[PDB]
PDB file of C-alpha atoms and ligand atoms in Angstrom:
ATOM      1  CA  UNK A   1     -16.691 -45.412 143.325  1.00 28.35           C
ATOM      2  CA  UNK A   2     -19.395 -44.241 141.479  1.00 28.19           C
ATOM      3  CA  UNK A   3     -21.537 -44.588 145.089  1.00 29.76           C
ATOM      4  CA  UNK A   4     -19.267 -41.451 146.044  1.00 27.16           C
ATOM      5  CA  UNK A   5     -18.545 -43.548 149.146  1.00 28.20           C
ATOM      6  CA  UNK A   6     -14.629 -44.178 149.335  1.00 25.00           C
ATOM      7  CA  UNK A   7     -14.016 -46.774 151.100  1.00 22.83           C
ATOM      8  CA  UNK A   8     -10.759 -47.119 153.635  1.00 26.66           C
ATOM      9  CA  UNK A   9      -8.161 -48.742 152.313  1.00 26.19           C
ATOM     10  CA  UNK A  10      -5.743 -47.823 149.159  1.00 24.98           C
ATOM     11  CA  UNK A  11      -3.478 -47.025 151.719  1.00 28.84           C
ATOM     12  CA  UNK A  12      -0.257 -48.069 151.178  1.00 30.38           C
ATOM     13  CA  UNK A  13       3.201 -47.931 153.496  1.00 32.57           C
ATOM     14  CA  UNK A  14       6.611 -48.803 152.793  1.00 35.35           C
ATOM     15  CA  UNK A  15       8.332 -50.783 155.225  1.00 34.12           C
ATOM     16  CA  UNK A  16      12.137 -51.512 156.058  1.00 37.11           C
ATOM     17  CA  UNK A  17      13.494 -55.164 157.122  1.00 37.70           C
ATOM     18  CA  UNK A  18      16.415 -55.126 159.519  1.00 36.94           C
ATOM     19  CA  UNK A  19      18.675 -57.763 161.310  1.00 38.13           C
ATOM     20  CA  UNK A  20      18.621 -60.484 159.582  1.00 37.85           C
ATOM     21  CA  UNK A  21      17.606 -59.704 156.187  1.00 37.67           C
ATOM     22  CA  UNK A  22      21.433 -59.254 154.684  1.00 36.14           C
ATOM     23  CA  UNK A  23      23.595 -61.405 152.744  1.00 37.27           C
ATOM     24  CA  UNK A  24      26.541 -61.054 150.798  1.00 39.50           C
ATOM     25  CA  UNK A  25      26.161 -59.987 147.429  1.00 42.39           C
ATOM     26  CA  UNK A  26      23.520 -56.914 149.026  1.00 41.59           C
ATOM     27  CA  UNK A  27      23.236 -54.271 146.579  1.00 39.27           C
ATOM     28  CA  UNK A  28      25.858 -55.161 144.309  1.00 39.52           C
ATOM     29  CA  UNK A  29      24.152 -55.131 141.335  1.00 40.60           C
ATOM     30  CA  UNK A  30      22.672 -51.020 142.074  1.00 40.53           C
ATOM     31  CA  UNK A  31      26.128 -50.241 142.006  1.00 38.20           C
ATOM     32  CA  UNK A  32      27.131 -48.639 138.985  1.00 40.03           C
ATOM     33  CA  UNK A  33      23.894 -48.881 137.292  1.00 39.90           C
ATOM     34  CA  UNK A  34      21.580 -46.577 138.752  1.00 40.03           C
ATOM     35  CA  UNK A  35      22.703 -42.954 139.041  1.00 42.33           C
ATOM     36  CA  UNK A  36      20.390 -42.810 142.455  1.00 46.69           C
ATOM     37  CA  UNK A  37      21.368 -46.214 144.201  1.00 46.38           C
ATOM     38  CA  UNK A  38      25.044 -45.151 143.637  1.00 46.79           C
ATOM     39  CA  UNK A  39      24.483 -41.343 145.015  1.00 51.27           C
ATOM     40  CA  UNK A  40      23.444 -43.950 148.048  1.00 54.92           C
ATOM     41  CA  UNK A  41      26.010 -46.447 147.934  1.00 53.42           C
ATOM     42  CA  UNK A  42      29.295 -43.689 147.422  1.00 52.58           C
ATOM     43  CA  UNK A  43      28.013 -41.544 150.443  1.00 52.84           C
ATOM     44  CA  UNK A  44      28.174 -44.056 152.609  1.00 53.48           C
ATOM     45  CA  UNK A  45      31.327 -45.731 151.116  1.00 57.32           C
ATOM     46  CA  UNK A  46      32.917 -41.682 151.519  1.00 58.52           C
ATOM     47  CA  UNK A  47      31.116 -41.695 155.113  1.00 54.55           C
ATOM     48  CA  UNK A  48      31.993 -44.667 157.009  1.00 52.03           C
ATOM     49  CA  UNK A  49      35.456 -45.867 158.566  1.00 50.33           C
ATOM     50  CA  UNK A  50      34.961 -49.590 156.895  1.00 47.75           C
ATOM     51  CA  UNK A  51      35.049 -51.060 153.527  1.00 50.07           C
ATOM     52  CA  UNK A  52      31.042 -50.729 153.593  1.00 51.02           C
ATOM     53  CA  UNK A  53      30.329 -51.924 149.483  1.00 50.10           C
ATOM     54  CA  UNK A  54      33.135 -54.386 150.241  1.00 47.54           C
ATOM     55  CA  UNK A  55      31.403 -56.141 153.429  1.00 48.08           C
ATOM     56  CA  UNK A  56      27.996 -55.764 151.308  1.00 50.07           C
ATOM     57  CA  UNK A  57      29.416 -57.002 148.129  1.00 48.89           C
ATOM     58  CA  UNK A  58      32.013 -59.635 149.031  1.00 49.84           C
ATOM     59  CA  UNK A  59      32.457 -59.718 152.282  1.00 49.23           C
ATOM     60  CA  UNK A  60      35.649 -61.185 152.349  1.00 48.74           C
ATOM     61  CA  UNK A  61      36.440 -60.880 156.521  1.00 45.50           C
ATOM     62  CA  UNK A  62      32.877 -62.282 157.330  1.00 41.48           C
ATOM     63  CA  UNK A  63      31.496 -59.608 159.205  1.00 40.35           C
ATOM     64  CA  UNK A  64      28.228 -58.505 157.232  1.00 43.31           C
ATOM     65  CA  UNK A  65      26.682 -60.409 160.105  1.00 41.45           C
ATOM     66  CA  UNK A  66      28.178 -58.642 162.407  1.00 39.07           C
ATOM     67  CA  UNK A  67      25.510 -55.781 163.824  1.00 38.51           C
ATOM     68  CA  UNK A  68      28.480 -52.604 163.979  1.00 35.13           C
ATOM     69  CA  UNK A  69      28.130 -53.413 159.918  1.00 36.11           C
ATOM     70  CA  UNK A  70      24.989 -54.861 159.115  1.00 39.28           C
ATOM     71  CA  UNK A  71      23.224 -52.169 160.620  1.00 39.92           C
ATOM     72  CA  UNK A  72      24.758 -49.153 158.069  1.00 38.68           C
ATOM     73  CA  UNK A  73      24.300 -51.994 154.930  1.00 40.45           C
ATOM     74  CA  UNK A  74      20.736 -52.823 155.746  1.00 42.12           C
ATOM     75  CA  UNK A  75      20.363 -48.756 155.656  1.00 39.83           C
ATOM     76  CA  UNK A  76      22.764 -48.009 153.053  1.00 42.06           C
ATOM     77  CA  UNK A  77      20.586 -50.913 150.689  1.00 42.02           C
ATOM     78  CA  UNK A  78      16.953 -50.000 151.416  1.00 41.29           C
ATOM     79  CA  UNK A  79      17.883 -46.344 150.986  1.00 40.92           C
ATOM     80  CA  UNK A  80      19.561 -46.716 147.640  1.00 39.70           C
ATOM     81  CA  UNK A  81      17.013 -48.415 146.718  1.00 40.90           C
ATOM     82  CA  UNK A  82      14.319 -46.176 148.214  1.00 40.06           C
ATOM     83  CA  UNK A  83      16.035 -43.725 146.163  1.00 38.68           C
ATOM     84  CA  UNK A  84      16.120 -45.214 142.673  1.00 38.00           C
ATOM     85  CA  UNK A  85      12.200 -45.623 143.221  1.00 41.32           C
ATOM     86  CA  UNK A  86       9.899 -43.456 141.502  1.00 44.29           C
ATOM     87  CA  UNK A  87       6.460 -41.643 142.166  1.00 45.24           C
ATOM     88  CA  UNK A  88       6.444 -44.190 145.742  1.00 44.62           C
ATOM     89  CA  UNK A  89       3.754 -42.642 147.125  1.00 44.42           C
ATOM     90  CA  UNK A  90       3.630 -44.091 150.773  1.00 43.06           C
ATOM     91  CA  UNK A  91       1.214 -43.105 153.337  1.00 43.73           C
ATOM     92  CA  UNK A  92       2.720 -44.772 156.312  1.00 44.22           C
ATOM     93  CA  UNK A  93       5.876 -46.028 156.420  1.00 44.41           C
ATOM     94  CA  UNK A  94       7.612 -48.908 159.678  1.00 42.35           C
ATOM     95  CA  UNK A  95      10.968 -50.806 159.854  1.00 45.51           C
ATOM     96  CA  UNK A  96      11.906 -53.816 162.158  1.00 44.41           C
ATOM     97  CA  UNK A  97      13.979 -52.525 164.710  1.00 42.90           C
ATOM     98  CA  UNK A  98      17.342 -50.832 162.260  1.00 42.59           C
ATOM     99  CA  UNK A  99      14.721 -50.806 159.794  1.00 43.35           C
ATOM    100  CA  UNK A 100      12.766 -48.112 161.259  1.00 43.64           C
ATOM    101  CA  UNK A 101      16.098 -45.386 160.114  1.00 44.08           C
ATOM    102  CA  UNK A 102      15.201 -46.512 157.378  1.00 44.27           C
ATOM    103  CA  UNK A 103      11.503 -45.461 158.394  1.00 42.97           C
ATOM    104  CA  UNK A 104      13.212 -41.938 159.229  1.00 43.00           C
ATOM    105  CA  UNK A 105      14.950 -41.222 155.997  1.00 39.23           C
ATOM    106  CA  UNK A 106      12.075 -42.590 154.148  1.00 37.72           C
ATOM    107  CA  UNK A 107      10.300 -39.943 155.522  1.00 38.36           C
ATOM    108  CA  UNK A 108      13.076 -37.211 155.867  1.00 40.59           C
ATOM    109  CA  UNK A 109      13.211 -37.224 159.947  1.00 37.04           C
ATOM    110  CA  UNK A 110      16.903 -37.645 159.347  1.00 40.79           C
ATOM    111  CA  UNK A 111      19.015 -37.301 156.144  1.00 42.31           C
ATOM    112  CA  UNK A 112      20.752 -40.627 154.532  1.00 43.17           C
ATOM    113  CA  UNK A 113      24.273 -39.552 155.732  1.00 43.34           C
ATOM    114  CA  UNK A 114      22.523 -38.328 159.336  1.00 43.83           C
ATOM    115  CA  UNK A 115      21.221 -42.411 159.680  1.00 45.08           C
ATOM    116  CA  UNK A 116      23.984 -44.048 157.941  1.00 49.20           C
ATOM    117  CA  UNK A 117      26.574 -42.385 161.279  1.00 50.60           C
ATOM    118  CA  UNK A 118      23.604 -43.122 163.667  1.00 49.11           C
ATOM    119  CA  UNK A 119      23.105 -46.401 163.171  1.00 49.15           C
ATOM    120  CA  UNK A 120      26.613 -47.398 162.777  1.00 46.61           C
ATOM    121  CA  UNK A 121      27.027 -46.113 166.422  1.00 47.19           C
ATOM    122  CA  UNK A 122      23.815 -48.026 167.162  1.00 47.22           C
ATOM    123  CA  UNK A 123      25.229 -51.230 165.959  1.00 47.46           C
ATOM    124  CA  UNK A 124      28.954 -50.535 167.501  1.00 48.91           C
ATOM    125  CA  UNK A 125      27.228 -49.767 171.136  1.00 48.07           C
ATOM    126  CA  UNK A 126      24.939 -52.863 170.524  1.00 45.94           C
ATOM    127  CA  UNK A 127      27.791 -55.136 169.495  1.00 44.61           C
ATOM    128  CA  UNK A 128      29.900 -53.841 172.551  1.00 41.49           C
ATOM    129  CA  UNK A 129      27.367 -53.673 175.215  1.00 38.66           C
ATOM    130  CA  UNK A 130      28.582 -56.955 177.374  1.00 40.85           C
ATOM    131  CA  UNK A 131      30.806 -59.208 177.008  1.00 40.51           C
ATOM    132  CA  UNK A 132      30.313 -62.253 175.026  1.00 41.68           C
ATOM    133  CA  UNK A 133      28.406 -65.037 177.097  1.00 44.98           C
ATOM    134  CA  UNK A 134      26.180 -62.849 179.038  1.00 44.72           C
ATOM    135  CA  UNK A 135      23.252 -62.035 177.171  1.00 45.61           C
ATOM    136  CA  UNK A 136      21.567 -63.430 174.255  1.00 45.83           C
ATOM    137  CA  UNK A 137      18.295 -63.808 172.059  1.00 46.13           C
ATOM    138  CA  UNK A 138      16.484 -67.060 170.730  1.00 44.55           C
ATOM    139  CA  UNK A 139      13.206 -67.381 168.778  1.00 43.73           C
ATOM    140  CA  UNK A 140      10.367 -69.230 170.264  1.00 44.04           C
ATOM    141  CA  UNK A 141       8.048 -70.992 167.245  1.00 39.78           C
ATOM    142  CA  UNK A 142       4.596 -72.170 167.410  1.00 44.75           C
ATOM    143  CA  UNK A 143       3.730 -70.874 170.503  1.00 41.01           C
ATOM    144  CA  UNK A 144       1.037 -67.623 171.317  1.00 36.89           C
ATOM    145  CA  UNK A 145       2.552 -64.530 172.768  1.00 37.72           C
ATOM    146  CA  UNK A 146       0.690 -64.970 176.116  1.00 41.74           C
ATOM    147  CA  UNK A 147       2.699 -68.684 176.538  1.00 43.03           C
ATOM    148  CA  UNK A 148       6.060 -67.761 175.465  1.00 46.37           C
ATOM    149  CA  UNK A 149       5.125 -64.422 178.164  1.00 46.08           C
ATOM    150  CA  UNK A 150       3.838 -67.285 180.812  1.00 45.91           C
ATOM    151  CA  UNK A 151       7.295 -69.126 180.040  1.00 43.92           C
ATOM    152  CA  UNK A 152       9.645 -66.063 180.164  1.00 44.49           C
ATOM    153  CA  UNK A 153       8.472 -64.675 183.887  1.00 44.29           C
ATOM    154  CA  UNK A 154       8.729 -68.467 185.264  1.00 44.37           C
ATOM    155  CA  UNK A 155      12.466 -68.495 183.768  1.00 44.95           C
ATOM    156  CA  UNK A 156      13.731 -64.661 184.603  1.00 46.11           C
ATOM    157  CA  UNK A 157      14.597 -65.679 188.736  1.00 46.28           C
ATOM    158  CA  UNK A 158      17.744 -65.353 190.296  1.00 48.25           C
ATOM    159  CA  UNK A 159      18.653 -61.576 189.210  1.00 45.40           C
ATOM    160  CA  UNK A 160      18.260 -62.958 185.744  1.00 45.80           C
ATOM    161  CA  UNK A 161      16.285 -62.287 182.784  1.00 49.62           C
ATOM    162  CA  UNK A 162      14.116 -63.040 180.061  1.00 48.83           C
ATOM    163  CA  UNK A 163      11.942 -61.226 178.488  1.00 51.03           C
ATOM    164  CA  UNK A 164      10.075 -61.058 174.838  1.00 52.79           C
ATOM    165  CA  UNK A 165      11.510 -58.711 172.344  1.00 47.68           C
ATOM    166  CA  UNK A 166      10.235 -58.671 168.335  1.00 49.23           C
ATOM    167  CA  UNK A 167       7.190 -59.896 168.229  1.00 50.65           C
ATOM    168  CA  UNK A 168       6.737 -60.871 164.785  1.00 50.63           C
ATOM    169  CA  UNK A 169       3.763 -62.867 163.946  1.00 53.46           C
ATOM    170  CA  UNK A 170       1.705 -65.039 165.491  1.00 52.40           C
ATOM    171  CA  UNK A 171       3.903 -68.546 166.110  1.00 46.91           C
ATOM    172  CA  UNK A 172       6.928 -66.282 166.209  1.00 46.55           C
ATOM    173  CA  UNK A 173       8.107 -64.225 169.508  1.00 45.06           C
ATOM    174  CA  UNK A 174      11.797 -63.899 169.850  1.00 45.30           C
ATOM    175  CA  UNK A 175      12.870 -63.949 173.686  1.00 45.66           C
ATOM    176  CA  UNK A 176      15.691 -62.318 174.469  1.00 46.44           C
ATOM    177  CA  UNK A 177      18.380 -61.645 177.951  1.00 48.03           C
ATOM    178  CA  UNK A 178      20.866 -63.143 180.295  1.00 48.95           C
ATOM    179  CA  UNK A 179      21.753 -66.277 178.352  1.00 48.34           C
ATOM    180  CA  UNK A 180      21.921 -69.034 180.665  1.00 45.55           C
ATOM    181  CA  UNK A 181      18.087 -68.317 181.197  1.00 44.07           C
ATOM    182  CA  UNK A 182      18.085 -67.937 176.700  1.00 42.19           C
ATOM    183  CA  UNK A 183      20.039 -71.426 176.968  1.00 43.54           C
ATOM    184  CA  UNK A 184      17.786 -72.619 179.221  1.00 41.40           C
ATOM    185  CA  UNK A 185      14.655 -71.828 176.852  1.00 40.90           C
ATOM    186  CA  UNK A 186      16.350 -73.383 174.064  1.00 39.62           C
ATOM    187  CA  UNK A 187      16.824 -76.633 176.264  1.00 38.58           C
ATOM    188  CA  UNK A 188      13.727 -77.370 177.142  1.00 38.21           C
ATOM    189  CA  UNK A 189      11.573 -75.293 174.559  1.00 39.55           C
ATOM    190  CA  UNK A 190      10.543 -78.525 172.948  1.00 36.78           C
ATOM    191  CA  UNK A 191       9.472 -80.340 176.227  1.00 38.35           C
ATOM    192  CA  UNK A 192       7.279 -76.884 176.549  1.00 40.78           C
ATOM    193  CA  UNK A 193       5.138 -77.160 173.691  1.00 39.26           C
ATOM    194  CA  UNK A 194       7.135 -75.009 171.404  1.00 38.60           C
ATOM    195  CA  UNK A 195       7.610 -76.132 167.524  1.00 40.16           C
ATOM    196  CA  UNK A 196      11.079 -74.944 167.658  1.00 41.71           C
ATOM    197  CA  UNK A 197      13.945 -72.600 170.148  1.00 42.39           C
ATOM    198  CA  UNK A 198      16.195 -71.485 167.938  1.00 40.17           C
ATOM    199  CA  UNK A 199      19.109 -69.330 169.663  1.00 41.62           C
ATOM    200  CA  UNK A 200      19.858 -66.882 167.670  1.00 43.01           C
ATOM    201  CA  UNK A 201      23.224 -65.255 166.121  1.00 41.54           C
ATOM    202  CA  UNK A 202      23.581 -62.318 167.953  1.00 43.13           C
ATOM    203  CA  UNK A 203      26.110 -60.761 170.137  1.00 39.98           C
ATOM    204  CA  UNK A 204      23.990 -59.467 173.231  1.00 42.29           C
ATOM    205  CA  UNK A 205      20.217 -59.509 174.403  1.00 40.79           C
ATOM    206  CA  UNK A 206      18.464 -56.990 172.260  1.00 43.95           C
ATOM    207  CA  UNK A 207      15.351 -55.221 172.905  1.00 43.09           C
ATOM    208  CA  UNK A 208      15.669 -56.534 176.545  1.00 41.98           C
ATOM    209  CA  UNK A 209      15.486 -53.836 179.613  1.00 41.68           C
ATOM    210  CA  UNK A 210      19.207 -54.757 179.870  1.00 40.52           C
ATOM    211  CA  UNK A 211      19.862 -53.158 176.721  1.00 43.68           C
ATOM    212  CA  UNK A 212      19.513 -49.636 179.272  1.00 43.45           C
ATOM    213  CA  UNK A 213      23.349 -49.697 179.997  1.00 41.45           C
ATOM    214  CA  UNK A 214      23.664 -47.771 176.039  1.00 43.13           C
ATOM    215  CA  UNK A 215      20.593 -45.701 176.393  1.00 42.33           C
ATOM    216  CA  UNK A 216      23.182 -42.580 177.097  1.00 39.13           C
ATOM    217  CA  UNK A 217      26.086 -43.126 175.410  1.00 39.27           C
ATOM    218  CA  UNK A 218      23.389 -43.531 172.542  1.00 40.06           C
ATOM    219  CA  UNK A 219      21.275 -40.215 173.249  1.00 37.82           C
ATOM    220  CA  UNK A 220      24.640 -38.477 173.292  1.00 38.48           C
ATOM    221  CA  UNK A 221      25.365 -39.347 170.142  1.00 38.85           C
ATOM    222  CA  UNK A 222      22.412 -38.963 168.131  1.00 38.73           C
ATOM    223  CA  UNK A 223      22.257 -34.759 169.841  1.00 40.38           C
ATOM    224  CA  UNK A 224      24.712 -34.582 167.378  1.00 39.80           C
ATOM    225  CA  UNK A 225      22.897 -34.584 164.380  1.00 40.80           C
ATOM    226  CA  UNK A 226      19.324 -32.225 163.714  1.00 40.13           C
ATOM    227  CA  UNK A 227      16.327 -34.551 163.688  1.00 38.96           C
ATOM    228  CA  UNK A 228      13.183 -33.402 161.753  1.00 40.89           C
ATOM    229  CA  UNK A 229       9.252 -33.901 161.391  1.00 42.76           C
ATOM    230  CA  UNK A 230       8.795 -36.796 159.436  1.00 46.48           C
ATOM    231  CA  UNK A 231       6.746 -36.181 155.956  1.00 49.50           C
ATOM    232  CA  UNK A 232       3.984 -39.052 156.657  1.00 46.27           C
ATOM    233  CA  UNK A 233       3.695 -41.037 160.021  1.00 48.09           C
ATOM    234  CA  UNK A 234       5.964 -43.603 160.993  1.00 45.22           C
ATOM    235  CA  UNK A 235       4.653 -46.051 162.778  1.00 45.81           C
ATOM    236  CA  UNK A 236       7.514 -46.379 165.548  1.00 45.02           C
ATOM    237  CA  UNK A 237       8.589 -50.367 167.098  1.00 49.45           C
ATOM    238  CA  UNK A 238       8.103 -49.142 170.749  1.00 50.36           C
ATOM    239  CA  UNK A 239       3.979 -47.927 170.745  1.00 52.76           C
ATOM    240  CA  UNK A 240       2.533 -48.879 167.541  1.00 52.19           C
ATOM    241  CA  UNK A 241       1.275 -46.270 166.410  1.00 55.40           C
ATOM    242  CA  UNK A 242       2.478 -43.458 163.789  1.00 53.50           C
ATOM    243  CA  UNK A 243       3.883 -40.883 165.038  1.00 52.06           C
ATOM    244  CA  UNK A 244       5.072 -37.561 163.287  1.00 52.75           C
ATOM    245  CA  UNK A 245       6.811 -35.139 166.316  1.00 52.77           C
ATOM    246  CA  UNK A 246      10.772 -34.896 165.722  1.00 51.56           C
ATOM    247  CA  UNK A 247      11.054 -34.751 169.526  1.00 48.17           C
ATOM    248  CA  UNK A 248       8.459 -37.700 170.097  1.00 48.14           C
ATOM    249  CA  UNK A 249      10.214 -39.699 167.528  1.00 48.75           C
ATOM    250  CA  UNK A 250      13.778 -38.878 168.705  1.00 48.92           C
ATOM    251  CA  UNK A 251      12.606 -40.001 172.373  1.00 48.68           C
ATOM    252  CA  UNK A 252      11.274 -43.455 171.390  1.00 50.72           C
ATOM    253  CA  UNK A 253      13.947 -44.070 169.213  1.00 46.52           C
ATOM    254  CA  UNK A 254      16.279 -44.382 172.200  1.00 47.09           C
ATOM    255  CA  UNK A 255      12.991 -46.666 174.255  1.00 45.96           C
ATOM    256  CA  UNK A 256      13.256 -48.942 170.841  1.00 45.80           C
ATOM    257  CA  UNK A 257      16.736 -49.988 171.624  1.00 45.41           C
ATOM    258  CA  UNK A 258      15.455 -51.302 174.894  1.00 45.19           C
ATOM    259  CA  UNK A 259      11.940 -52.225 174.198  1.00 42.48           C
ATOM    260  CA  UNK A 260      10.169 -55.465 172.545  1.00 40.51           C
ATOM    261  CA  UNK A 261       9.677 -54.482 168.790  1.00 41.52           C
ATOM    262  CA  UNK A 262       5.333 -54.433 168.352  1.00 42.59           C
ATOM    263  CA  UNK A 263       5.677 -55.306 164.813  1.00 45.78           C
ATOM    264  CA  UNK A 264       2.362 -57.776 165.275  1.00 40.29           C
ATOM    265  CA  UNK A 265       0.501 -54.322 166.666  1.00 38.70           C
ATOM    266  CA  UNK A 266       2.625 -52.300 164.173  1.00 39.12           C
ATOM    267  CA  UNK A 267       0.902 -53.870 161.073  1.00 43.22           C
ATOM    268  CA  UNK A 268      -2.542 -54.071 162.301  1.00 44.24           C
ATOM    269  CA  UNK A 269      -2.457 -50.430 163.367  1.00 42.70           C
ATOM    270  CA  UNK A 270      -1.554 -50.046 159.514  1.00 43.51           C
ATOM    271  CA  UNK A 271      -3.966 -52.215 158.974  1.00 42.70           C
ATOM    272  CA  UNK A 272      -7.251 -50.487 160.796  1.00 43.63           C
ATOM    273  CA  UNK A 273      -6.455 -47.468 159.398  1.00 45.26           C
ATOM    274  CA  UNK A 274      -6.951 -48.812 155.814  1.00 45.44           C
ATOM    275  CA  UNK A 275      -3.305 -49.889 154.635  1.00 46.85           C
ATOM    276  CA  UNK A 276      -3.792 -53.002 152.277  1.00 47.50           C
ATOM    277  CA  UNK A 277      -1.067 -52.706 150.421  1.00 48.37           C
ATOM    278  CA  UNK A 278       2.564 -52.942 151.986  1.00 47.92           C
ATOM    279  CA  UNK A 279       6.055 -52.431 150.115  1.00 49.46           C
ATOM    280  CA  UNK A 280       8.897 -54.324 151.512  1.00 48.02           C
ATOM    281  CA  UNK A 281      12.177 -52.203 150.397  1.00 48.91           C
ATOM    282  CA  UNK A 282      16.254 -53.984 151.214  1.00 45.88           C
ATOM    283  CA  UNK A 283      17.075 -57.785 150.991  1.00 46.55           C
ATOM    284  CA  UNK A 284      14.846 -60.385 151.388  1.00 46.25           C
ATOM    285  CA  UNK A 285      11.193 -60.637 152.169  1.00 45.50           C
ATOM    286  CA  UNK A 286      11.437 -61.506 155.880  1.00 44.83           C
ATOM    287  CA  UNK A 287       8.397 -58.264 156.622  1.00 45.32           C
ATOM    288  CA  UNK A 288       6.622 -60.013 153.520  1.00 43.05           C
ATOM    289  CA  UNK A 289       6.285 -63.076 155.391  1.00 43.26           C
ATOM    290  CA  UNK A 290       5.651 -61.904 158.757  1.00 42.15           C
ATOM    291  CA  UNK A 291       2.519 -59.779 157.083  1.00 44.26           C
ATOM    292  CA  UNK A 292       1.392 -62.559 156.012  1.00 43.76           C
ATOM    293  CA  UNK A 293       1.276 -64.293 158.824  1.00 41.04           C
ATOM    294  CA  UNK A 294      -0.962 -61.457 160.518  1.00 42.23           C
ATOM    295  CA  UNK A 295      -3.466 -60.757 157.261  1.00 40.30           C
ATOM    296  CA  UNK A 296      -3.241 -62.784 154.609  1.00 39.24           C
ATOM    297  CA  UNK A 297      -5.644 -60.276 152.485  1.00 37.53           C
ATOM    298  CA  UNK A 298      -3.386 -57.385 151.880  1.00 38.02           C
ATOM    299  CA  UNK A 299      -1.678 -56.962 149.300  1.00 37.75           C
ATOM    300  CA  UNK A 300       2.701 -57.378 149.285  1.00 39.07           C
ATOM    301  CA  UNK A 301       5.560 -56.754 147.344  1.00 36.33           C
ATOM    302  CA  UNK A 302       9.000 -56.936 147.562  1.00 36.71           C
ATOM    303  CA  UNK A 303      11.788 -54.593 146.054  1.00 36.96           C
ATOM    304  CA  UNK A 304      14.509 -56.676 146.454  1.00 36.51           C
ATOM    305  CA  UNK A 305      17.161 -55.730 143.534  1.00 35.62           C
ATOM    306  CA  UNK A 306      17.687 -52.925 140.163  1.00 32.98           C
ATOM    307  CA  UNK A 307      15.161 -55.492 138.243  1.00 35.51           C
ATOM    308  CA  UNK A 308      12.547 -54.830 140.492  1.00 34.65           C
ATOM    309  CA  UNK A 309      13.126 -51.093 140.758  1.00 33.56           C
ATOM    310  CA  UNK A 310      12.806 -51.230 137.117  1.00 31.71           C
ATOM    311  CA  UNK A 311       9.550 -53.369 136.882  1.00 31.13           C
ATOM    312  CA  UNK A 312       7.594 -50.956 139.586  1.00 32.49           C
ATOM    313  CA  UNK A 313       9.414 -47.979 137.630  1.00 32.57           C
TER     314      UNK A 313
HETATM  315 CA1   CA B   1      17.146 -47.228 168.423  1.00 35.42          CA
END
């Protein structure tokens, strides 16, 4: 201001949701109503080997929530919104699990066509990593991280493991690992003091050390594309810090598979750099809800529809 002392603040981060934020009908309002968004949607349609747009808009096969489909659907919706927005001037970005790929497209690490192929393979490898019934995930609500981690250490036994996977906000920690231990937690969660332990609709033990089984296949595929440096820092899920290096970001995308999503620490790191406005771009406002529980003073904007794009523009 007029004192010549500009407070740390006024930085803005654009952020992107992942699995769990999809909805049938997503992006149907953009298609053929905005040229930039439609370029992205038609790119995804021409690139993918299934009918991504039918799957997003009407999902007559009820497969939108199967992660091999949901991942490219979410990337496509967030990127289509992003392409339609004018003078979005982010200082940083982050995204939740799949959402980090939307950050990579936003920061020009990856082109949209390279990223949509990459996340389709990421979804197919995750979906096929373990047979039905071997690994799963559950949301533990109402407990501090230290208590959830203790519980996980107690139940991990007999060569089976359960680990904190998605560290979302105070009172919401998703855990992941062998299904027998996930189901024991589901059964005993109330007695252990959790407000609610919700088993989740997932095909495997995502973001647990068990996902090392797909590291090699994923590293091999991602070498088929050119990765670039980021134009502004991507706060990565593995380490909760801003990264711009192409080789550091690429290596962290492979580690991301089998490492917990550090959403609380990434949110905190961004606020400690002076981010006071987060703009969520995608279907739903799930990350805005998590950030509100992390810090109630920062500003939250959600961009979900063509009308929200018009209002911003
Ligand atoms: Ca990854």
